[PDB]
Amino acid sequence: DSVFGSTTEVAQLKKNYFLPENIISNADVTRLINSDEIQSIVKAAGPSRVKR
Amino acid sequence: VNIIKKRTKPFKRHQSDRFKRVGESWRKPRGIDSCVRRRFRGTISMPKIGYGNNKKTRYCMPNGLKAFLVRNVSDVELLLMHNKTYAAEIAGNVSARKRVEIVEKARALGVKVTNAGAKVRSQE
Amino acid sequence: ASIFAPESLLKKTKAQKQSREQIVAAAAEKKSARQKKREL
Amino acid sequence: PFIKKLAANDRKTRDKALESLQRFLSQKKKFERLDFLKLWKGLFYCMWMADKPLYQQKLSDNLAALVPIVWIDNRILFQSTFWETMGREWTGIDILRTDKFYLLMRRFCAAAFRDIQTRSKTALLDKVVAEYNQMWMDGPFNTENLAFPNGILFHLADIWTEELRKVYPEDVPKADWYLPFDSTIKSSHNVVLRKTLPKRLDRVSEYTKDS
Amino acid sequence: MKFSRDVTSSRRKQRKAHFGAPSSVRRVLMSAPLSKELREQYKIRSLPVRRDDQITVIRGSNKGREGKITSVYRKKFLLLIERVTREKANGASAPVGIDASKVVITKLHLDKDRKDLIVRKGGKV
Amino acid sequence: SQRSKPASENVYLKLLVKLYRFLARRTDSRFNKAILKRLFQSKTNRPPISISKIAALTSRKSASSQNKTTVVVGTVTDDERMLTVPKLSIAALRFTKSARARILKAGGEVLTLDQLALRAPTGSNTVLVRGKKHA
Amino acid sequence: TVREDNGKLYLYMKTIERAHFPSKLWQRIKLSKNYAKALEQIDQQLLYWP
RNA sequence: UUGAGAAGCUCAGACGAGUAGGCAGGCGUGGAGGUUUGUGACGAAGCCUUGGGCGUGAGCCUGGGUCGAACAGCCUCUAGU
RNA sequence: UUUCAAUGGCCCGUCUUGAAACACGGACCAAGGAGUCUAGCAUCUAUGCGAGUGUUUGGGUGAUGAAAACCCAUCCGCGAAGUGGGAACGCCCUUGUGGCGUGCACCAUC
């Protein structure tokens, strides 16, 4: 914790160093896509690989 | 399902049969005044993407299987689920001590081996 | 004693039921509309 | 009742800490909100670490049955802090742990109705729901808290009537059962929430007075 | 791993040192193990070979043979052991060279210099 | 570098493109289509927008910003020249350390593009903004 | 997954909650030599799995 | 219906000369980091062959012979490629 | 694979030239054999941070190679110095249609 610090608190052993932040908070894209918040407003999915 | 090959003859380098210094491996003719590049009548054919074979039957042997190079018993066990699509091919540098154990293992797995009788004899 | 049928499954089955209801109703009226259309 | 023991890496320690915490929650003292918020950080991770479906069905039952054990004075704070920690950590869960936490929220949804019925034996039902409707409105159904996920509220709408009927199998008395949803649908700044909550909710106006 | 900057791990310099070594170094390069009896009685693991030493051949085609060391051939790093020979075309017996690490010393040609060597290398007699 | 996939090798940027690929085709919103297009854009085409521009744009003319989330596919830098920061809710690819601290301590919140997709999957009540490309 | 040990096939299962305990990550059950019972064993142990 | 290397799978239609030049993806070589719990005196590498196979091609795999101590696939790095 | 039969098939590269004609280079095989390194500049992409940014002149440090990695005192360089159309969104409501607002980037008008 002193070598690397935290994403909000500076590292003790590295002057003015903070841990990098992420472009996504939660990196489980399946959890976002298959969530109740998102799946409740998507239109009815067409079929998978369609018949010829 | 039958394997169709658009062509069986290889594409030889132009003028490769007149000189030993020029190998058979295909080289694109860069000459502008070359009859082979301009594709006259009687000139040899060139590798075109039209000759490409069916995607489904690509890499398939005439028996319908795809070759899978195997160096030990661990490689041949991977084909437990894919024994109807792939054939085991023991590498050329695998010794006869391991070739026999690969062939016996591939027998129980129900896997065809393309070179199963190499560097060994039989004793009934 | 028994596993309780995960709540994601219950949410999906409710959603699929709504869509299945719509599909039958759409095809139910489509067959009537198609039969009249063919006569026209 | 140590929080660090509630989130231990072995299940035997977590179960022992859960049992010790059963007495700690029944003291006749007022716990501040921060004390319960820290307590619910360990309890969330006690549930977050449950492995098999049969254990996490019983574990969620144990956590829900913990509510009547708490002292009546700070019992509302116990639920209000549960829904605060289930809103700030909901989006951080993964897709394989949502089903185990859906059941916990469902068990606590019914734990509120069951506590309403218990207090209705002595006190009048109208004020008991009013205390709970204040908890719902100040917490999950707050309109000024934009960061509270709709997944929690969509789940609550789906199970509100079905878990109220479980508590009152015979008949459901008149009360403001669906007050939090009425306030949310009317005056929420989430157009997705108010356009979909009436579809999810199945409120029965059979008993509530006609407006 | 070696940590001294005074010793080289270079294969080029290690091979040059071994094959270009002088005679007083090849005396130590040509060392042989002692038998278990001598090893636990002289408290010494290995000693440089010497003439008149009685050895047993441990490796090679001549494995199991015994005999005195007639002479040590330091040029080619070989031992010449008595009665360990090879017949030639004309029937003359040509001795066969054995590496000093492929033999074991079952009896030592003890001298005052070697007796001093034993007490020097933590030994006793 | 801009057409069908980002040129970026960032794994987490690919996870956002994957999320908004689903949102663009499974919803009839032009916000999800616009956000997805701006994820393929290069760093030159995604200029930073200062914390002062967000405050100015929301409380502009009639103001009445209410609580609409400000969305930028880019970095929200800080403007130390402005001294009082309003209560803002911004969702961006990246915030600088000073901008994130100023937004949080001065009222509101900071979001990622995946936290906003769960709050406004169709991008309703969002103020989609851009940085000036004059540079 | 199913794998074989000295002539006996076992069902191996792992859950997200044991992901950081490698020694206890995978659990194992015995699958009966009866094929019909072996199929039902997989169905019961993998209940509500995809 | 299991067909989520979502960098996958799938459906449909049109199209196909090409110098300069523009662009993309691949094949091969020496060495380096990682990896294959990799191959090898029961034979590595190399070479030979009207043996067999794979790829549109660069090329790759393999049988037999010869041979005698090293060598390769995959991700990345590098260049006297 | 060899060989036969039928049909076809002008020697390759370079330069020339509409084109060729040409004139050149080529007895054969093996091995070697030609856009490389570096300094500056500009565009573009990626990566880090962002009104900042750049540790490696140097110092500290590094016991398992210590020419690596790790750390940063003082400087210094480069930067800082209203009306229309319109992306996107909400609300409708004859509902689609359109209208009412909010209007980024950028372009026109003061």
From D92, D93, D151, residue closest to A37, measured CB to CB: D151
- Residue B16 CB in 7 A reach of strand H: no
Overall resolution, Å: 3.0
For the four alpha carbons of C25, C27, C32 and C36, in that order, the dihedral sign comes to positive
Can you tell me which residue has the tokens 């437990």? B80
Antiparallel, parallel or unpaired: β E93-98 and F49-50: unpaired
Q: How many CB atoms lie within 10 A of CB D73?
A: 11
Cα–Cα distance measured from residue G46 to residue G50, given in angstroms and rounded to the nearest whole number: 8
Instruction: Note whether F107 and F85 are within 8 A (CB).
Output: yes
Q: Which nucleotide is nearest to F65 (CA to C1')?
A: I102
Cα–Cα distance measured from residue D1 to residue D23, given in angstroms and rounded to the nearest whole number: 8
Interface of G with C in 8-47 (CB under 8 A): 47
Cα–Cα distance measured from residue B48 to residue B31, given in angstroms and rounded to the nearest whole number: 18
Helix (H/G/I), strand (E/B), else coil: B97: helix
Task: Tell the burial category of B24 from Cβ atoms under 10 Å away from its Cβ (0-12, 13-18, 19+).
Answer: exposed
B14 secondary structure, DSSP code = T
Instruction: Note whether E38 and E106 are within 8 A (CB).
Output: yes
Q: Which two tokens stand for residue E110?
A: 């003890």
Chains G and A: 3 or more CB pairs within 8 Å of each other: no
Distances (CA, A) of B77 to B106, F95, G5: 8, 51, 14
Task: Report residue F43 CA to chain centroid gap.
Answer: 14
Single-letter code of the amino acid located at E106? T
Helix (H/G/I), strand (E/B), else coil: D162: helix
Instruction: Note whether B90 and B115 are within 8 A (CB).
Output: yes
Cβ within 8 Å of residue D181, ≥6 positions away? D141, D157, D160, D197, D201, D203
Q: Which two tokens stand for residue F124?
A: 């309703």
Q: Please state how this structure was obtained.
A: cryo-EM
Task: Tell the burial category of D180 from Cβ atoms under 10 Å away from its Cβ (0-12, 13-18, 19+).
Answer: buried
Instruction: Note whether D1 and D49 are within 8 A (CB).
Output: no
Radius of gyration, CA atoms only, chain G = 12
For the four alpha carbons of D123, D27, D106 and C5, in that order, the dihedral sign comes to negative
Residue ranges per structural domain of chain F: 1-135
From F94, F97, F112, residue closest to A18, measured CB to CB: F97
Q: For every residue of E71-102, which 3-state class applies, written as one string?
A: EEECCCCEEEEEEEEEECCCCCEEEEEECHHH
Cα–Cα distance measured from residue G47 to residue D22, given in angstroms and rounded to the nearest whole number: 33
Which 4-43 residues of chain E approach strand I with CB closer than 7 Å?
A: 5, 9
Distances (CA, A) of E121 to E116, E118, G16: 9, 5, 63
Cβ within 8 Å of residue F32, ≥6 positions away? F20, F23, F24, F121, F122, F123
Cα–Cα distance measured from residue D32 to residue C25, given in angstroms and rounded to the nearest whole number: 56
Q: How many Å from the CA of E8 to C1' of I63?
A: 19
Please give the protein residue whose CA is closest to the C1' of the nucleotide H12.
A52
Q: Measured between CA atoms, how close is C16 to chain D, in angstroms?
A: 14
- Residue whose C-alpha is closest to residue D181's, from D163, D199, D206, D162: D199
Count how many Cα atoms sit within 13 Å of the Cα of residue D98 in the half-sphere of its side chain. Answer: 23
Number of helices (H), then strands (E), in chain G: 1, 3
From G16, G18, G21, residue closest to D97, measured CB to CB: G16
Instruction: Note whether F67 and F87 are within 8 A (CB).
Output: no
Q: How many Å from the CA of B45 to C1' of I19?
A: 25
Q: Measured between CA atoms, how close is D155 to chain C, in angstroms?
A: 9
Task: Report residue B109 CA to chain centroid gap.
Answer: 23
Cα–Cα distance measured from residue A9 to residue A18, given in angstroms and rounded to the nearest whole number: 6
Residue contact F15–A35, C-beta within 8 A: no
Task: Give residue D138's domain range.
Answer: 1-211
Helix (H/G/I), strand (E/B), else coil: E21: coil
Cα–Cα distance measured from residue B28 to residue B77, given in angstroms and rounded to the nearest whole number: 42
Consecutive H or E run containing B87: strand B86-90
From first CA to last CA, the distance across chain E in angstroms is 36
- Residue whose C-alpha is closest to residue A44's, from C17, F36, F37: C17
Which 34-73 residues of chain F approach strand I with CB closer than 7 Å?
A: 34, 42-45, 48, 53, 57, 60-62, 64, 68
Q: How many Å from the CA of D207 to C1' of I1?
A: 98
Instruction: Note whether F36 and F29 are within 8 A (CB).
Output: no
Instruction: Note whether F16 and F113 are within 8 A (CB).
Output: yes
For the four alpha carbons of F76, F82, F83 and F86, in that order, the dihedral sign comes to negative
Alpha helices in D70-97 (DSSP H): 75-88
Task: Tell the burial category of D88 from Cβ atoms under 10 Å away from its Cβ (0-12, 13-18, 19+).
Answer: middle
Q: For every residue of chain F, which 3-state class applies, written as one string?
A: CCCCCCCCCCHHHHHHHHHHHHHHHHCCCHHHHHHHHHHCCCCCCCCCEEHHHHHHHHCCCCCCCCCCEEEEEEEEECCCCCCCCCCCEEEEEEECHHHHHHHHHCCCEEECHHHHHHHCCCCCCEEECCCCCCC
- Residue B16 CB in 7 A reach of strand I: no
Which 68-97 residues of chain B approach strand H with CB closer than 7 Å?
A: 69, 71-72, 74, 89-97
Contacts of C19 in chain A (CB under 8 A): 44
Task: Tell the burial category of D76 from Cβ atoms under 10 Å away from its Cβ (0-12, 13-18, 19+).
Answer: middle
Cα–Cα distance measured from residue D118 to residue D69, given in angstroms and rounded to the nearest whole number: 12
How many A/D residue pairs have CB atoms within 8 Å? 30
> Which site among D89, D154, D156 would you substitute to test the A interface, given the most A Cβ atoms closer than 10 Å to its Cβ?
D154
Q: Which two tokens stand for residue D1?
A: 């009742």
Across chain E, the runs of DSSP E, i.e. the strands, are 31-33, 46-48, 54-57, 66-73, 78-87, 93-98, 103-107
Can you tell me which residue has the tokens 């605060």? D84
Angle at F74 between CA F68 and CA F75, to 5 degrees: 95
